Structure formats: structure tokens, C-alpha cells
Write a structure and sequence with these properties.
The protein contains 42 helices and five strands. It is mainly alpha-helical and 1135 residues long. It folds into eight domains: 2-123, Up-down Bundle (Four Helix Bundle (Hemerythrin (Met), subunit A)), CATH 1.20.120; 145-316, no CATH class; 323-439, Voltage-gated potassium channels. Chain C (Four Helix Bundle (Hemerythrin (Met), subunit A)), CATH 1.20.120; 444-559, Helix Hairpins, CATH 1.10.287.70; 569-685, Up-down Bundle (Four Helix Bundle (Hemerythrin (Met), subunit A)), CATH 1.20.120; 693-855, Helix Hairpins (Orthogonal Bundle), CATH 1.10.287.70; 884-937 and 949-995, Four Helix Bundle (Hemerythrin (Met), subunit A) (Up-down Bundle), CATH 1.20.120.350; 997-1135, Helix Hairpins (Orthogonal Bundle). The strands form two sheets. It has a three-stranded antiparallel beta sheet, with no helix packed on it. The protein has a two-stranded antiparallel ribbon with strand order 4-5. The longest helix is centred in the C-terminal third of the chain and has 55 residues, at 805-859. It starts with a helix and ends with a helix. The chain binds 1,2-Distearoyl-sn-glycerophosphoethanolamine (3PE), cholesterol hemisuccinate (6 copies), 2-acetamido-2-deoxy-beta-D-glucopyranose (2 copies) and calcium ion (CA) (2 copies). One calcium ion binds at residues 263-264, 514, 776-777, 1074. It is found in: Membrane.
């Protein structure tokens, strides 16, 4: 109409969307300027100007809203409320109007002002690529409810189990005696805490609750041992982490289960529970890890990738002067090119050598060699411009980059006054990048990565929008509420605060990477309210388990003589190797010299070596050592077996050479390390594992180029870190660590000059610190050291140079991009091979599948025995009482059961106890009723043929078993062990399993997982083998590492030390989960008090290599498990 026609031209004008983006970004800038610490009631200048700015922003938002209503209509498809984001704009408009009205009404109510944080989200609609991507995500969300139902199942089951086991157990601190007598000056706290303010609480074990740490393990204070008076412990206090880690409610149990889904703070709460209730809760926590933290979030990855696959496909289916020429000859010689490669490579090596406290001669050699390299590069400059001409030299921009490098180097040499030595020397690293001009594979790989980034960029903007929104939300709700209290005369703010958008964004990025996100979880749950954990739950879930899986999907679909008998010899030698494994898992560094088991271990080594040399001889006489083709050493596995048996022989020889063992103890160490390497022939002696290892290697070449590029970036950033941080990672750890600046001040105080184990002095230490950074573990402390670092021998000061956040976070982003590229390369590599196999066997498989549709035709009507029950008083039972009208009742009763179990907590009302008793009676009675109903509906044939009525009968049998024991405590018929009652209650949870019948999506998805168990099981066996090998190897390397007060541990707390074997298997699992693995490797590399050779040994060479290699192999194995699940899911999508 005419009124509509007046404004449609302006509304449809792209100038309107341009000014919409302008004001959206201006609104983002206005939201970013909030200073929660300083903007107190907005009694400041910038507060007032920002209020005016936001006022104008809301005025324009209201104006554009009314313009679009009066130009497009309301409440219709063509109308304004047609697109989703228009409704969102209306939502912010309404919320802002409400906030403005309450501002007029003089009602502060700082909770609707916390809707401003949603205003940046409007930028999604006013960007085409962003709008398409977000619409695709919103369309793939409704198909994610299945894995969200899996999430609910394996959160609720573990929440019920946790609340039923450890309801309030975490609270029992160790108190003084009940009637305590003190002469005077009562300084004893009511209970015992090792650290101040219950930072590391002392959760005991109750009398009857067979924990481990039971108040007789108290640290003897070292006068009078005041600690021994903490005798009895009772369940009344605040519970650990300022009341944040407990199992009282089911919300708190869900918080803890989430904390172990993200694999952060796993061990701390694990040992909290072990202290509280029982040592055997490791089954609970390890099962939760394996099920949730790996089989859930990676099923989330699989589901998002798949759903985005056919959601891309669905939308896609809707559409569907004479010397100049002579001087060139020297250039294109293919050997001069290699000579300049060698020059550049040795220049890189020269830049890598520099370290802290250089010898005076060494830096001179470095600068002279720099001059030589700059002279050679300038010679190439002048040569190529002459022999080619100006245009030809400038035709290729690689030569332009070379000229830039030469100019910068020359200026650096010339600029010997100031400034040049600070930046241009740091710019020397550009010469490393000249290799791209030469390596042919790293051109194609880099171009492919840029082709990917052609799709990543919009998703990067989406991620930045998301992180900005949540950083603003954090500033709003956590501003000035994270203030750590006074310890030196002032309440210094926590480093992971939310007081400024710089710190807000760094903290939100840190939370997304899952490093010390539990600390901010606790300090935001103990400051505002326990409901503040929803902030972190939403942040982590949308970021990691939705958005990052979305990016993975984006990339994946962007790409897409003597007699010989060999009947059971392999199987029997596999059994022998397993027995060898059993005796390898025993060589703990705790056996007394000459003990009974020591002799057994020696003789077992001898007999196993005899068996292996026997099979060696059998194989070689069957084949021949190297005597022609088809010999013993013509396969990789046979060569490995030969190497292992030869190592065992030479180790036995050296052991028999024990007489005069000096100077060969290192040789014994090396032979023992290879002895740990020994249990690896199971791969050779098994077909499935051998095939899987072959496939794992075949899936490593396609990502080999990306691995080389990422190692090159590690070297580049290592040299950069060496430049930036040389002697700056030294601090005076002492009583004060205050009012002191340089090391001379510390030596005046005589505290200590502590040298961090993670620092950038050498390039090897820089590379180890960079690997710790790039594993998104322990990287926050490294970053804090970087920002704090000041100079060679003075105290780092807090946030001295925040600009180094760029280094420490750009490294994380580049390594993350390369890791996602390795993951997608592995996925697409498996895709090709599995696709071929599919074609072939599935063509034959779709022949028999039409044969199976003919089988259903056959199925037909075999006079189904409904008549036998019809008119037999079951005329209603078989049909009218087995229909979906009767099973909705079962599902409703199950949901009521779920919400009843979700009500148990600590100190619950006894009235509520009896209410749950009656509800449980109701549920059990109706379950028995429906079991009888189906039993009379049909006879014993389908009773076991259904295979699900079996499940219902098992559930009702367990239920009636549980309820009967309750009556025993009413009539006091017999004293029943409370453990049996606990088992019955904790296994009442099995009534959830009946939801699996109607959740046909659960059946489909879990099945799709199930027919991946060939590959998943084989990789799991390989992964257990990796744990075995690396655990034995760690037992011998780090076994003698004593954990005590004299050696204050950081990562190996109580049962994670490498002392025994199993205590090393636990810590290898903990490293595999990436929880405080860097801490553990900090414990391993540690100069001791000369009490053992291990600290003073070559552990610096092998411990970082140990941990790095284990982390890499574990991650690769788990990635290939995920990939196998993904390809089986896509093959199921084919069928
Ligand atoms: C340089 C080599 C890659 C370094 C990248 C890195 O930072 O390693 C840690 C990374 C953390 O894994 P994330 O899923 O991000 O938590 O872990 C990874 O993402 C490593 C996965 C790719 C590593 C491939 C090479 C490892 C050797 C596998 C041999 C298996 C033989 C059997
Ligand atoms: C992934 C879902 C479908 C299955 C999860 C099963 C576990 C959560 C259950 C089954 C076995 C239960 C464990 C069986 C044995 C013990 C030892 C027991 O220790 C003593 O009481 C002594 C404490 C309960 C606990 C940890 C149980 C904790 C909960 C567990 C691990
Ligand atoms: C791969 C190339 C381009 C980089 C150079 C390899 C580095 C990883 C290695 C080789 C030279 C080594 C450095 C040679 C000299 C020393 C001095 C040394 O100081 C001593 O006095 C002993 C400490 C080890 C360090 C820094 C080494 C650290 C590890 C370095 C840098
Ligand atoms: C739906 C969830 C999973 C994602 C959406 C995130 C936010 C919309 C929610 C999740 C966490 C909630 C916060 C949890 C904690 C806080 C502090 C909490 O503490 C207070 O009572 C402060 C009272 C005051 O400041 O006067 C009040 C609710 C609030 C603001 C909540 C506001 C709304 C939040 C940020
Ligand atoms: C399947 C096999 C090839 C690998 C897995 C074997 C482990 C499950 C078993 C085999 C030997 C067992 C170890 C045998 C010896 C020890 C030392 C033992 O501690 C002590 O002897 C000191 C305390 C004391 O002496 O009473 C604790 C059990 C432990 C770690 C056992 C942990 C579990 C182990 C490693
Ligand atoms: C390639 C990325 C994925 C990981 C790189 C792993 C290794 C190549 C790095 C990590 C740990 C580094 C080692 C860490 C410790 C040292 C410091 C330095 O040893 C010293 O302290 C010298 C003084 C002395 O102890 O005598 C020699 C380099 C070295 C072996 C480093 C050599 C290079 C290592 C093995
Ligand atoms: C991925 C999953 C399958 C790894 C399985 C882990 C268990 C095989 C490890 C982890 C915890 C270890 C336990 C940690 C503590 C000890 C105490 C130790 O000495 C007491 C005896 C071995 C034992 C039971 C360990 C036995 C082997 C355990 C159960
Ligand atoms: C440190 O220096 C300050 C200077 O202001 C002084 O007041 C203080 O007594 C010194 N010592 C300690 C332990 O703080
Ligand atoms: C180190 O700090 C002290 C503080 O008393 C100062 O006097 C001195 O100049 C500083 N620098 C040195 C010792 O090189
Ligand atoms: Ca982690
Ligand atoms: Ca951590």
C-alpha cells in the first residue's frame, strides 16, 4: 500500500544494512567499555558518554524496528516476523524498552541490563555468509537432540549414583574431640586443614565409610604436635572448594560430572571421593571418563559432522651486457638452488643456537655469521636483479619478499644506535619463511590450507562474536566479584578475573580451551551463587561441543629347510607374550635386592628369552635370515622381533657381566628401556592389530605435510620465544616475594632464585614450553610468566607487558588450526578408502537387501496367535491394552521415577523420604502390573523372543528385590547389611533403560556405534598396549622419584607416582586425559637433593620426549577411533 511504499525503498536499500552494521559494531564498542570495578553507579564522564551512546543506539533500533513493521507487515510469512532473526531483533527491542522503563521507574535491577549482552548477536543477520552459516547451524540443531538425550542419560545415571553414594560425604573434616580441654589462648581451629582457608581440604573417612585417609594419616606438625588432637571427624562444615564440589543435590553432582566431562580437575575430585567414601570409586570416575568425556563429546562431534553433511546436501539439492643470459644459467642450475637452501637452513640453525648466558665469544660468532648471511642474501639481491631485469625480478613476489628481507637485514646492521637491535633482530625469523619458495609440497599443502580458510573465516567471525558476547556477560555478572582476598595488606584481584574486557576475553578463551576453567567455575560459584555454573556450562557446551564440531564439519565437507608346522603357533606364542607382559608389569623399583620375586623375575626373563630365541630359530630356518627374497627379515614386524630378541640377548650378556659393572650402568639402563619396549610383538602375532597398525600408518602420510608445517611453526615460534624471553623466567619464591626487584634483593632476603621448569632459555626448553602451550594444558601459567617477565635478573611484575598475549594466543590458534587440519585430513583419507570398499561390497550387499525385502514379503500373516487370547478374557489385552495408548503410561511413570530419584539429597526431609518410598512402591507395583499384563497378552514364546520383555522382567525383578529388603527394616526381621541396601538403591537406576524402546533414535545412534566395534575395539586394544608399554617404561624411568615433603609434588599426588606399575598406569591414563600432564612432567624433570641418580641423570633428554610422544600417540589413536565411528556413521547414512 501507499504507507508501506513510502519506506520500502529505504528498508530495502543496502545502505540501511550498512548503517545497521555500523551501529551494531558501535554498540559492541559501547558494551566493551564497561569497567565493572570502576563504573560504580556510572558516576564518571565516560559512563555518561557511553550512556548517551547506548541511548542513541536503542533509539535507532526502535526506529528501524517500527520502519520494518510499517514496511513489511506483522505476524506473517512475508511479514516482519518471517525470518528468525527479525524476531530476535524484536526481542532485544522489547527487552531494552522494559529496561528503559525500569530506569525511569528508579528500579536499578541489574539483571535486565544483562540483556544488552545479546545486542551483538544481531550482527548475524546483517552478514550473508554469517547468516547462511548460522541458519545451517540452527537447522542442524534439531537433529542433535538425540546426542543431547544421550547426554542427559549419562549425566542423570551418574548424578543419581553420585548423590546416592556421596551425599554429604565431602563435608566430613577432621575435628577436635567432642569435650576438648584447653588451658587458654584457644588458637586451634575447630577442625584440621592442611592449607589456609580450606584451599586443600582434609576430607576424612567416616567410621563405617571405609575410605582411605582416616585422620591417622594427619601430617605431624613440625614444640607440641597440635595436630594429633584432631581425633574424630564429623560431617558438618563447608565442603571442598568453597562449597562448589559436593554431591549433596543432583545439580551439584551434575556440576562435578560436567567437570570430569571436560577432563579438568579430574584427579582432585577423584581423590576427594576416595578420601570420603571408598578407594574403589576409581571404577566410577574412569567409567565416567570413558563414557562421557570420550564416547559423548566425540559422539557429539560425529553427530554434528554428519547432520551438517546431509544438511549441506539437503540445501544443495534444492538448487540441484651479453652476460645477462649467461648469468641466468648459474641461477637455474638445480645445485645453486640447493646451495642457497643450505645457506638459509644453516642461518636458521644459527638463529636457533642462541641461549641464556651466552659465552662472550659465542655471540660474536653469531653476529659475524649473521653478517655473512646478510652479505650472501644481498649478493643474491644484486645478482638476480641484473641477470633477470627489474620486471622479471619483480614478476615473482617471492623475490620481492627476498628484497624486503635483505633491506631489513641491512638496516639492522646499519642501525647500531637503538631500536633496530630490539625489533629488526626479532625480524630475522622471516628468513626461515624463504623455504616456501623452494619446497614443492609445502606450496600445495599451504594453498590447500588457505582454500580451507576461505571457509573458516566466516566461522572465525562467528567464534569471535560468541567469545565477545560471553566475555561481556562475564563482565556483567562476575565483575569485581572475583577479588581474591588480602594476603599482603590488599585484596589483590585474581589473575583470571573478569574486571576488564581484555581479561574477560582472555578468561573466556581460556575457559573454551579447558585449562583452569574449574578454578573460575569455583570462584564464580562461590561469589554470586551456585547457579553461576550455568554460565560456564552454556559457554563450554556451545563453544567446544557445538561450534568447534561445526567447524570440523565445515572443513570435512569442504574437502569432500627343517619340518615346519604353523597350526596354532601364532596363538600359542601370543599366549607366551601375554605371560611375558604379566611378568613385565611387576618390575617395580621397590623389590629388595635378592628377594623371592626378584629371582622369579630373573628366571622368567631367562625362560622368555629362551622361548623367543626358539621361535627366532624356527622362523629363520623356515625362511632364512637374509638369504634371498621371502626370508625372515623381509617384513617389518619380523625385523622388530629380531631387534627385540637381540636386545634381550645382549642385555642378558651384560647382566652376566655384572662383575665390574662400573661405567656400563647406563648401558644397563638402555637395555632396560628396550626391555619395556619389548611387549610389542602382539601386533605381529595378531591379524587385527597388525591390520589396524598398517591403517594407522597409512592414515599418517596424508597429514605428514601438515605435521612438518606444524613442526616448522613450532621451531619458528620457539626462536621467537627465545628472542622474547631469555633470563626473564626467574622469580624470588620466598616468604614475601614483595618490595624486591632484582636478584640482589632476593639474596639480601636469601629466599631463593627459582628457575621455572617451563621457560625459553634454550630453544629446546622453548620447544618444550611451546608443546605444553599447544596442548592447551598448563598454558595459563606459561602465559602468566610471559606477561610478568621483565628482564634478565629482576622480579617479574604482574601484567608488565600484556602485548605478549598476542604471541601466547596466536600460537594456540595456529596450532589449533593445524590440529583440526590433521583431523580433517585423516577423516578425508579414511573417506576415500572406505568409499572404495563400500562401492564394492555394498553393491553386492544391496543384492541380498532386495532379497531381504522379499524375506519381509514372505513374513506376511502366519495366523498370528491373537485369536488364542481373543475371547479368552484377553480380548482387550492383546490389542486394546498393548497399543501405544498403554505404553505412554509406562513412559510417564518412568519420567516420574526419574524426577523422584532426582530429589534425593543431603539432610532431606523424612517426610520426603517416606514420599519417595511410597512413589517407589507405586512404580514397582505398576511395573509388575504391566509385566503381568504383557505376560497374559502373549505366552512364553515372545517372552524370550522379544529380548526387551526380558529387560522389563529383569527391571521388575530387581525392583521387587529392592522393595522387599525395605520391609525388613520395619519389622526388624533380620539385620541387613547396609551395603546391600546401597547396591539395591543405586541399581534402581536401571528403570531408566526402558526409555530406550521409544527413543528409536537412541537405538539407531547407539547401534551405529555398535557396528563400529571392530575398528573401535581394535584401536582400544592398541591403546591399552600403548598404555602398557609406556607405563612400564615410565616405571623404570621415573620409578625412584620419591614424593614427600622434601620433594613437593605438583602432578603425581598420591597414587599417580610412578613407584608401582598400577600407580603409573593411573598417571598414564591421567596424562592421556590431559589433566595436569604438564605438572607431572614438571615433577619428573626436577633437580633433587642428590638422593638418587635419576634427578641428576639424563632425564632432561628423555622425560619431555617421553611425555610428548605418549601424548601424541594417545591423541592420534583416539582421533582414529573417532574417525572410524564417523565413517561407520556415514556408511549407515548410506543405508
Ligand atoms: C608437531 C606435532 C603436532 C603437535 C600439536 C600439539 O600441540 O600436540 C597436542 C595435541 C592436543 O590435542 P587436542 O585435541 O587439541 O586437546 O595433540 C594432537 O592433536 C596430536 C594429533 C596429531 C599427531 C600426529 C603425529 C603423532 C604420532 C602418531 C604415530 C602413531 C603410530 C601408531
Ligand atoms: C555408563 C553407565 C551406563 C554405567 C555406569 C556404571 C557405574 C556408574 C556404576 C556400576 C558399578 C558401580 C561401582 C561398583 C562398585 C563400587 C565400589 C563401592 O565401594 C564400596 O562401597 C566399598 C562404591 C560404589 C562403586 C564405586 C560403584 C560406583 C558406580 C558404578 C561404577
Ligand atoms: C633444528 C635447528 C634449526 C635448531 C637448533 C637445534 C636446537 C634444538 C638444539 C641444537 C643446538 C642446541 C643448543 C646448543 C648449545 C647449548 C648451550 C648449553 O649451555 C651449556 O653451557 C651446556 C645449553 C643447551 C644449548 C642451549 C642447546 C639447546 C638445544 C639446541 C639449541
Ligand atoms: C541457559 C544457560 C545454560 C545459558 C544462558 C547463559 C545466561 C543467560 C544465564 C546462565 C547463567 C545465568 C547467571 C547465573 C548467575 C547469575 C548470578 C546470580 O547471583 C545473584 O543473585 C546476583 C544478584 C544481584 O546481582 O543483585 C543471579 C543470576 C545470574 C545473573 C544468572 C543470569 C543469567 C545467566 C548468565
Ligand atoms: C594384563 C597385564 C599384562 C597388565 C596388567 C597387570 C596389572 C593389572 C597387575 C599385574 C601385576 C599387578 C601389580 C603387582 C604389584 C603391585 C605392587 C603392590 O604394592 C606393594 O607391593 C607395596 C605394598 C605392600 O607391599 O603391601 C600394589 C599392587 C601392584 C601395583 C599390582 C598392580 C596391578 C598389577 C600391575
Ligand atoms: C616437536 C615438538 C612437537 C615437540 C619437541 C620435542 C623435543 C624435540 C624437545 C622437547 C623437550 C626438549 C628438550 C628439553 C630439555 C633440554 C634442555 C637442554 O638441556 C640442558 O638443560 C642443558 C644443560 C644440562 O642439563 O646439562 C638441552 C635441550 C633439551 C634436551 C631439549 C631438546 C629438544 C626437546 C627434546
Ligand atoms: C582406559 C581404562 C580402561 C584404563 C584402566 C585403568 C585401570 C587399569 C588402572 C587405573 C587406576 C589403577 C589403579 C590405581 C591404584 C592402584 C593402587 C595400587 O596399590 C595399592 C594397586 C594398583 C591400583 C589398584 C591400580 C590398578 C590399575 C588401575 C585400576
Ligand atoms: C618491604 O618494603 C616496604 C616499603 O614500602 C616496607 O614498608 C616493608 O616493611 C618491607 N618489608 C616487607 C616484609 O614488606
Ligand atoms: C637492584 O635493586 C637494588 C634495590 O636496593 C638497587 O639498589 C640496585 O640499584 C638494583 N640494581 C643492581 C644491584 O644492579
Ligand atoms: Ca584439558
Ligand atoms: Ca589442567
Amino acid at each position: 500500500t501507499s504507507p508501506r511504499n513510502w519506506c520500502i525503498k529505504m528498508v530495502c536499500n543496502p545502505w540501511f544494512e550498512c548503517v545497521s552494521m555500523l551501529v551494531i559494531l558501535l554498540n559492541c564498542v559501547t558494551l566493551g567499555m564497561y569497567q565493572p570495578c570502576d563504573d560504580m553507579d556510572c558516576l564518571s564522564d565516560r559512563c555518561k558518554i557511553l550512556q548517551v551512546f547506548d541511548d542513541f543506539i536503542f533509539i535507532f533500533f526502535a526506529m528501524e524496528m517500527v520502519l520494518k513493521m510499517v514496511a513489511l507487515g506483522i505476524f506473517g510469512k512475508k511479514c516482519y516476523l518471517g525470518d528468525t532473526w527479525n524476531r530476535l531483533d524484536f526481542f532485544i527491542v522489547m527487552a531494552g524498552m522494559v529496561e528503559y522503563s525500569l530506569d525511569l521507574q528508579n528500579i536499578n535491577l541489574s539483571a535486565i541490563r544483562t540483556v544488552r549482552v545479546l545486542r551483538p548477536l544481531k550482527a548475524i543477520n546483517r552478514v550473508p555468509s554469517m547468516r547462511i552459516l548460522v541458519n545451517l547451524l540452527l537447522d542442524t540443531l534439531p537433529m542433535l537432540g538425540n546426542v543431547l538425550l544421550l547426554c542427559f542419560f549419562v549425566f542423570f545415571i551418574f548424578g543419581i549414583i553420585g548423590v546416592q553414594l556421596w551425599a554429604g560425604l565431602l563435608r566430613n573434616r577432621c575435628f577436635l574431640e567432642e569435650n576438648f580441654t584447653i588451658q587458654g589462648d584457644v588458637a586451634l581451629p575447630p577442625y584440621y586443614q592442611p592449607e589456609e582457608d580450606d584451599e586443600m581440604p582434609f576430607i576424612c573417612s567416616l567410621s563405617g565409610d571405609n575410605g582411605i585417609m582416616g585422620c591417622h594419616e594427619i601430617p605431624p606438625l613440625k614444640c607440641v604436635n597440635w595436630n594429633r588432637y584432631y581425633n574424630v571427624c564429623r560431617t558438618g562444615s563447608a565442603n571442598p572448594h568453597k562449597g562448589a564440589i559436593n554431591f549433596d543435590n543432583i545439580g551439584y553432582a551434575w556440576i562435578v560430572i560436567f567437570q570430569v566431562i571436560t577432563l579438568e580437575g579430574w584427579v582432585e575430585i577423584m581423590y576427594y571421593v576416595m578420601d570420603a567414601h571408598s578407594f574403589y570409586n576409581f571404577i566410577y570416575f574412569i567409567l565416567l571418563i570413558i563414557v562421557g568425556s570420550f564416547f559423548m563429546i566425540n559422539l557429539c562431534l560425529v553427530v554434528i559432522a554428519t547432520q551438517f553433511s546431509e544438511t549441506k546436501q539437503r540445501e544443495h539439492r534444492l538448487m540441484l651486457r651479453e652476460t645477462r643470459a649467461k648469468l641466468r644459467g648459474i641461477v637455474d642450475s638445480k645445485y645453486f638452488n640447493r646451495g642457497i637452501m643450505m645457506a638459509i637452513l644453516v642461518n636458521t640453525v644459527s638463529m636457533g643456537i642462541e641461549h641464556h648466558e651466552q659465552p662472550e665469544e659465542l655471540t660474536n660468532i653469531l653476529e659475524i655469521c649473521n653478517v655473512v648471511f646478510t652479505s650472501m642474501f644481498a649478493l643474491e639481491m644484486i645478482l638476480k636483479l641484473a641477470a633477470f631485469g627489474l620486471f622479471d625480478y619483480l614478476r615473482n613476489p617471492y623475490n620481492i619478499f627476498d628484497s624486503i628481507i635483505v633491506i631489513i637485514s641491512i638496516w639492522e646492521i646499519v642501525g647500531q644506535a637503538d631500536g633496530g637491535l630490539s625489533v629488526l633482530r626479532t625480524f630475522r625469523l622471516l628468513r626461515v619463511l624463504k623455504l616456501v619458495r623452494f619446497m614443492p609440497a609445502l606450496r600445495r599443502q599451504l594453498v590447500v590450507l588457505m582454500k580451507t580458510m576461505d571457509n573458516v573465516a566466516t566461522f572465525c567471525m562467528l567464534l569471535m562474536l560468541f567469545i565477545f558476547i560471553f566475555s561481556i556477560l562475564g563482565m556483567h555478572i562476575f565483575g569485581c566479584k572475583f577479588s581474591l582476598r588480602t594476603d599482603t595488606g590488599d585484596t589483590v584481584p585474581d589473575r583470571k578475573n573478569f574486571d576488564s574486557l581484555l581479561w574477560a576475553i582472555v578468561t573466556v578463551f581460556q575457559i573454551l580451551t579447558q585449562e583452569d576453567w574449574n578454578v573460575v567455575l569455583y570462584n564464580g560459584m562461590a561469589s554470586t551463587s551456585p547457579w553461576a555454573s550455568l554460565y560456564f556450562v552454556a559457554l563450554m557446551t556451545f563453544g567446544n561441543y557445538v561450534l568447534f564440531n561445526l567447524l570440523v564439519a565445515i572443513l570435512v565437507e569442504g574437502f569432500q629347510q627343517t619340518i615346519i608346522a604353523h597350526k596354532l603357533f601364532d596363538y600359542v606364542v601370543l599366549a607366551f607374550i601375554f605371560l611375558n607382559c604379566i611378568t613385565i608389569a611387576l618390575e617395580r623399583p621397590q623389590i629388595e635386592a635378592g628377594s623371592t620375586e626378584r629371582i622369579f623375575l630373573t628366571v622368567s626373563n631367562y625362560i622368555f628369552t629362551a622361548i623367543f630365541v626358539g621361535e627366532m630359530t624356527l622362523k629363520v630356518v623356515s625362511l632364512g635370515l637374509y638369504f634371498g627374497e621371502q626370508a625372515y627379515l623381509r617384513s617389518s614386524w619380523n625385523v622388530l622381533d629380531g631387534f627385540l630378541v637381540f636386545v634381550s640377548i645382549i642385555d642378558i650378556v651384560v647382566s652376566l657381566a655384572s662383575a665390574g659393572g662400573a661405567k656400563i650402568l647406563g648401558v644397563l639402563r638402555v637395555l632396560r628401556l628396550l626391555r619395556t619396549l619389548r611387549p610389542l610383538r602382539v601386533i605381529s602375532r595378531a591379524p587385527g592389530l597388525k591390520l589396524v597398525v598398517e591403517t594407522l600408518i597409512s592414515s599418517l602420510k596424508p597429514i605428514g605435510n601438515i605435521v612438518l608445517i606444524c613442526c616448522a611453526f613450532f621451531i619458528i615460534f620457539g626462536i621467537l620465544g627465545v628472542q622474547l624471553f631469555k633470563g626473564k623466567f626467574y622469580h624470588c619464591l620466598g616468604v614475601d616475594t614483595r618490595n624486591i626487584t632484582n636478584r640482589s634483593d632476593c639474596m639480601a632476603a636469601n629466599y631463593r632464585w627459582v628457575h621455572h621448569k617451563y621457560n625459553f632459555d634454550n630453544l629446546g626448553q622453548a620447544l618444550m614450553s611451546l608443546f605444553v602451550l599447544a596442548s592447551k594444558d598448563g598454558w595459563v601459567n606459561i602465559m602468566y610468566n610471559g606477561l610478568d617477565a621483565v628482564a634478565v635478573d629482576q622480579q617479574p611484575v604482574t601484567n608488565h607487558n600484556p602485548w605478549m598475549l598476542l604471541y601466547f594466543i596466536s600460537f594456540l590458534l595456529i596450532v589449533s588450526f593445524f590440529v583440526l587440519n590433521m583431523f580433517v585430513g585423516v577423516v578425508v583419507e579414511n573417506f576415500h578408502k572406505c568409499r572404495q570398499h563400500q562401492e564394492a561390497e555394498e553393491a553386492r550387499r544391496r543384492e541380498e537387501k532386495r532379497l531381504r525385502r522379499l524375506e519381509k514379503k514372505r513374513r506376511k500373516a502366519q495366523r498370528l496367535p491373537y485369536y488364542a487370547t481373543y475371547c479368552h478374557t484377553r480380548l482387550l489385552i492383546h490389542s486394546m491394552c498393548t497399543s501405544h495408548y498403554l505404553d505412554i503410561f509406562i513412559t510417564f511413570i518412568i519420567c516420574l521415577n526419574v524426577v523422584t530419584m532426582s530429589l534425593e539429597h543431603y539432610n532431606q526431609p523424612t517426610s520426603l523420604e517416606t514420599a519417595l518410598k511410597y512413589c517407589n512402591y507405586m512404580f514397582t507395583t505398576v511395573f509388575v502390573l504391566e509385566a503381568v499384563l504383557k505376560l497374559v497378552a502373549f505366552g512364553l514364546r515372545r517372552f524370550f523372543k522379544d529380548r526387551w520383555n526380558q529387560l522389563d522382567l529383569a527391571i521388575v525383578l530387581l525392583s521387587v528385590m529392592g522393595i522387599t529388603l525395605e520391609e525388613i527394616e520395619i519389622n526388624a526381621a533380620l539385620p541387613i547389611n547396609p551395603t546391600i541396601i546401597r547396591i539395591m538403591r543405586v541399581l534402581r537406576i536401571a528403570r531408566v533403560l526402558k526409555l530406550l524402546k521409544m527413543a528409536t533414535g537412541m537405538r539407531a545412534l547407539l547401534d551405529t556405534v555398535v557396528q563400529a566395534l571392530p575398528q573401535v575395539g581394535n584401536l582400544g586394544l592398541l591403546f591399552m598396549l600403548l598404555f602398557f608399554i609406556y607405563a612400564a617404561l615410565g616405571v623404570e624411568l621415573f620409578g625412584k622419584l620419591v614424593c614427600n615433603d622434601e620433594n613437593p609434588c605438583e602432578g603425581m599426588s598420591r597414587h599417580a607416582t610412578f613407584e608401582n606399575f598400577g600407580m603409573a598406569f593411573l598417571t598414564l591414563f591421567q596424562v592421556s586425559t590431559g589433566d595436569n600432564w604438564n605438572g607431572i612432567m614438571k615433577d619428573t624433570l626436577r633437580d633433587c637433593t642428590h638422593d638418587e641418580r635419576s634427578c641428576l641423570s639424563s632425564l632432561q633428554f628423555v622425560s619431555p620426549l617421553y611425555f610428548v610422544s605418549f601424548v601424541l600417540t594417545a591423541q592420534f589413536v583416539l582421533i582414529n577411533v573417532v574417525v572410524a565411528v564417523l565413517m561407520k556413521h556415514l556408511d549407515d547414512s548410506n543405508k
